[PDB]
Amino acid sequence: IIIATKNGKVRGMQLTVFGGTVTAFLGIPYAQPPLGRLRFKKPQSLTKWSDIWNATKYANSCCQNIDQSFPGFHGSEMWNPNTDLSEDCLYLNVWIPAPKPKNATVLIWIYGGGFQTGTSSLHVYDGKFLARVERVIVVSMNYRVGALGFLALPGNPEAPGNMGLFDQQLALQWVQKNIAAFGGNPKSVTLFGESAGAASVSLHLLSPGSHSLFTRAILQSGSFNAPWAVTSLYEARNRTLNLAKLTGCSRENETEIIKCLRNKDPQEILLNEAFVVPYGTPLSVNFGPTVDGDFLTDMPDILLELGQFKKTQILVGVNKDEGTAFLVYGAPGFSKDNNSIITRKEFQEGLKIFFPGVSEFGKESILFHYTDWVDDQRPENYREALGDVVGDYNFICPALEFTKKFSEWGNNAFFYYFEHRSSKLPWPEWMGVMHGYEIEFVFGLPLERRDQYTKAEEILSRSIVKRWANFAKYGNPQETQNQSTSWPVFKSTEQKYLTLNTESTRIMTKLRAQQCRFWTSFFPKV
């Protein structure tokens, strides 16, 4: 089972999935390893090889700091890298149906991780379910994260910024030139991703160098206009410089800095990423997408506002409790191991943690818009309010605003609202429908009966998988057979969206409308 690619022959392996077979090619290199003098530079193209590359195991994950706040707890550790970390991590994976499809639609996954963490090899990113059940091809790639992938000395090719995005872009290029050999249709490629993955997919909509590398886009819990998604050219420099000092690489010649940062073990670079900013938060993106003048030619809010993106269909959506995950990473009085009833004072302190550089008036204005209580006696008023504050500001309102803005230029948009809490979810109940916990459903993990998911979850994943795959194949995320609720287009007027849950799937209008008017009109002025 050998496929000949443009750079050489690759050998895959055979997966038994649901009384059937998927061919997995795990760990195909798609760039020269960005090592030595290649560190921080854009990804260079891969020299040809004469052997049979053995793509039979996930490859090295990119260097990254590991969440060690809940050691031994699956709800945190399920997200930590499950392969050796290395700078030599520019690899991708391909699941194709067996037998080899003819002209299959291709799904390209971009993982999240706040642009600091993440890896394609995670169990909740296993594409074999989608390959088997919908006969699409799934591709996923590793891209550089943290400083190693997003250090920015603007204009300077030694550290131009946005390398991780250019890593992704080079993977998309690989699919364009090689997926035909695997039975995929290069003309039918849907980027999908979650969180920073979703912000990445949205940036590929803007980057002209990506416009011909895919067809459609799916944005799960993320978009480039999210407040955490794009570093200012200022802060990127202040960040690059503060890193140079912490490592002792402060030089007058800016390239002499990069040279100095190139003789540091990655461990030294990662240990210093944290304090590169002055006041971090649980959502800090120390090194992330920047306006490099290359991948990104202008500030994306301007590009969005003036229709300067790929015209195509988008599938956008968010989860019901996007914000609760971050509350247990610093917020006072919070814990995954109790119900986290917090007081007014505790809520106010938590705003200082999530909005450190914000004026008191700004923080009071958040308090005022979110404490008009329907019941003052309700003891978790503040706990739920602080979670909604983080979710509405960081995910739901920018994702909604992205969808209005993008659809205003005549393209079909579909907006979902995931509100099912996984029956196997290891975080406590009050954290609800958390950030990232729609992904297993998108990937069809409840489709394996051999797990402990309920029948209702199997049906929900089954429908989501159909809707996702029909969106990839046909720009339309309906399920047309099992008498399903029709998913209407999101228009700027009606703003209709589809709820996803095991109970009843409903068409609703104008998600978080009052919340988002505050976050999208008033709060940016503070």
Ligand X SMILES: *[C@@H]1O[C@H](CO[C@@H]2O[C@@H](C)[C@@H](O)[C@@H](O)[C@@H]2O)[C@@H](O[C@@H]2O[C@H](CO)[C@@H](O)[C@H](O)[C@H]2NC(C)=O)[C@H](O)[C@H]1NC(C)=O
Ligand Y SMILES: CC(=O)N[C@H]1[C@H]([C@H](O)[C@H](O)CO)O[C@@](O)(C(=O)O)C[C@@H]1O
Ligand Z SMILES: *[C@@H]1O[C@H](CO)[C@@H](O)[C@H](O)[C@H]1NC(C)=O
Ligand U SMILES: *[C@@H]1O[C@H](CO[C@@H]2O[C@@H](C)[C@@H](O)[C@@H](O)[C@@H]2O)[C@@H](O[C@@H]2O[C@H](CO)[C@@H](O[C@@H]3O[C@H](CO)[C@@H](O)[C@H](O[C@H]4O[C@H](CO)[C@@H](O)[C@H](O)[C@@H]4O)[C@@H]3O)[C@H](O)[C@H]2NC(C)=O)[C@H](O)[C@H]1NC(C)=O
Ligand V SMILES: *[C@@H]1O[C@H](CO[C@@H]2O[C@@H](C)[C@@H](O)[C@@H](O)[C@@H]2O)[C@@H](O)[C@H](O)[C@H]1NC(C)=O
* Residues annotated in a binding site: 79, 113-114, 435
Rounded-to-integer distance, Cα 217 and Cα 210, Å: 12
Nearest approach in angstroms of CB 271 to ligand X is: 12
Tell which one of 295, 416, 487, 518 touches Cl ion (CB under 5 A).
518
- To the query of whether residue 420 is one of the catalytic residues in this protein, the response is no
| Sole window of 142-150, 296-304, 388-396, 425-433 interacting with ligand Y (rule: CB under 6 A) | 425-433
Interface mask (CB under 6 A) for ligand U, residues 21-60, using x and -?
---------------------------------x------
Task: Name the active-site residue from 87, 158, 273, 322.
Answer: 322
Question: Going by C-beta distance under 8 Å and a sequence separation of 6 or more, which residues neighbour residue 134?
Answer: 465, 466, 469
Tokens of 305: 């506002």
Q: Does position 462 bind ligand V by CB under 6 A?
A: yes
Residue pair 396/471 in contact (Cβ under 8 Å)? The answer is: no
Complete DSSP assignment for 126-158: -THHHHHHH--EEEEE----HHHHH-B-TT-TT
Peptide bond into 99 cis (omega under 30): yes
Question: Going by C-beta distance under 8 Å and a sequence separation of 6 or more, which residues neighbour residue 153?
Answer: 159, 160, 161, 237, 240, 254, 257, 258
Q: Which is nearer to ligand A1IYQ, 334 or 471 (CB)?
A: 334
Interface mask (CB under 6 A) for ligand X, residues 249-288, using x and -?
--------------------------x--x----------
With CB cut-offs between 5 and 8 Å by kind, which of ligand A1IYQ, Cl ion, ligand Y, none does residue 518 bind? Cl ion
Question: In 3D, which of 93, 97, 94, 69 has the Cα closest to residue 83?
Answer: 93
Tell me which residue has tokens 């803005």.
405
| Sole window of 159-167, 299-307, 429-437, 497-505 interacting with ligand A1IYQ (rule: CB under 6 A) | 429-437
- To the query of whether residue 235 is one of the catalytic residues in this protein, the response is no
Binding residues for tacrine: 79, 435
Nearest approach in angstroms of CB 397 to ligand X is: 25
With CB cut-offs between 5 and 8 Å by kind, which of ligand Z, ligand A1IYQ, ligand Y, none does residue 263 bind? none
Q: How many residues bind ligand U (CB under 6 A)?
A: 2
Interface mask (CB under 6 A) for ligand Z, residues 89-108, using x and -?
-------------xx-----
Tokens of 414: 């579909």
Q: Does position 467 bind ligand V by CB under 6 A?
A: no
Rounded-to-integer distance, Cα 264 and Cα 249, Å: 10
Tell which phi-psi region holds residue 465, choosing left (phi > 0), alpha (psi between -120 and 50) or beta. alpha
Nearest approach in angstroms of CB 215 to ligand Z is: 9
Bridging pattern class, strands 91-97 and 20-29:
antiparallel
Q: Does position 337 bind ligand Y by CB under 6 A?
A: yes
Q: Tell me, rounded to whole angstroms, the distance of Cα 80 from its chain centroid.
A: 15
Rounded-to-integer distance, Cα 517 and Cα 513, Å: 6
Nearest approach in angstroms of CB 357 to ligand X is: 8
- Measured CA to CA in angstroms, residue 379 lies from 348, 369, 384 at distances of 16, 18, 10
Binding residues for substrate: 113-114
Q: Which is nearer to ligand Y, 262 or 336 (CB)?
A: 336
Core vs surface per residue 69-97: b (16+ CB within 10 A) or e: ebeeeebbeebebebebebebbbbbbbbb
Residue pair 104/131 in contact (Cβ under 8 Å)? The answer is: no
Nearest approach in angstroms of CB 443 to ligand A1IYQ is: 15
**Residues annotated catalytic, as ranges:** 195, 322, 435
User: Which residues of this protein are in contact with Cl ion, per CB under 5 A?
Assistant: 518, 522
Q: Which residues bind ligand Z (CB under 6 A)?
A: 102-103, 185, 187-188, 253, 255-256
List contacts with ligand Y (CB under 6 A). 336-337, 426-428
Contact positions vs ligand V (CB under 6 A): 462-463, 466, 479, 482
